Amino acid sequence: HHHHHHMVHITLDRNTANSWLIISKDRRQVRMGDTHQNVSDNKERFSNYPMVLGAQRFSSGKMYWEVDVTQKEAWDLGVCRDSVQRKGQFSLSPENGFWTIWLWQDSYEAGTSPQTTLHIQVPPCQIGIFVDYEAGVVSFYNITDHGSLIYTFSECVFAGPLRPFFNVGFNYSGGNAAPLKLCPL
Numbered sequence: 001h002h003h004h005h006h007m008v009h010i011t012l013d014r015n016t017a018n019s020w021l022i023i024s025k026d027r028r029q030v031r032m033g034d035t036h037q038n039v040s041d042n043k044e045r046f047s048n049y050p051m052v053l054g055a056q057r058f059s060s061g062k063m064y065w066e067v068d069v070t071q072k073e074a075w076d077l078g079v080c081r082d083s084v085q086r087k088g089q090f091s092l093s094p095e096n097g098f099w100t101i102w103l104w105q106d107s108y109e110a111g112t113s114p115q116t117t118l119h120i121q122v123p124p125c126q127i128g129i130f131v132d133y134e135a136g137v138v139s140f141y142n143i144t145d146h147g148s149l150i151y152t153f154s155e156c157v158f159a160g161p162l163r164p165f166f167n168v169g170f171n172y173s174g175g176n177a178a179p180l181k182l183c184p185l
């Protein structure tokens, strides 16, 4: 791919974070805390899952960013509608306003309904996310494997402003404490 030149500087929005997340001072890294992080509740915070949104909202153009997933066992990444449900249980699907991939139990899958098996020969340490708003495209790239394509959502019906979407995953195993990090341009 030649998407690097649409690179955008993403920062995390503290106010959207699940109350157990710890976001770094520079708002470029997030990890699961071992307890409630002593913040007030609000209608923006994801309640059920360890999720957080980027601060940036996109309604046009082409945008590209990279996320470090080194040594994580579980995570979700992609984009979502600004108006996604925050409270209670829900599935990650385009019908619910999410365009995502994930790792779970040693398999990678795209957040279609039902979910789609991904074919990744080189487990990624960094993921590139490309959004073309006008074309209705969200693509995912394996930066560890020379930028190889992972998955393309096409004919996307965004139906509103988009925000970068992150899930650090739970850490029941003690093997998933590592952060998500936004990689430098």
Ligand SMILES: COC(=O)N1CCN(c2ccc(F)cc2)CC1
Pocket: 031, 070, 071, 072, 177, 178, 179
């Ligand atoms: C107080 O700090 C922590 O407990 N942690 C959680 C574990 N960390 C980590 C980073 C990279 C990695 F590959 C594996 C683990 C670093 C941050």
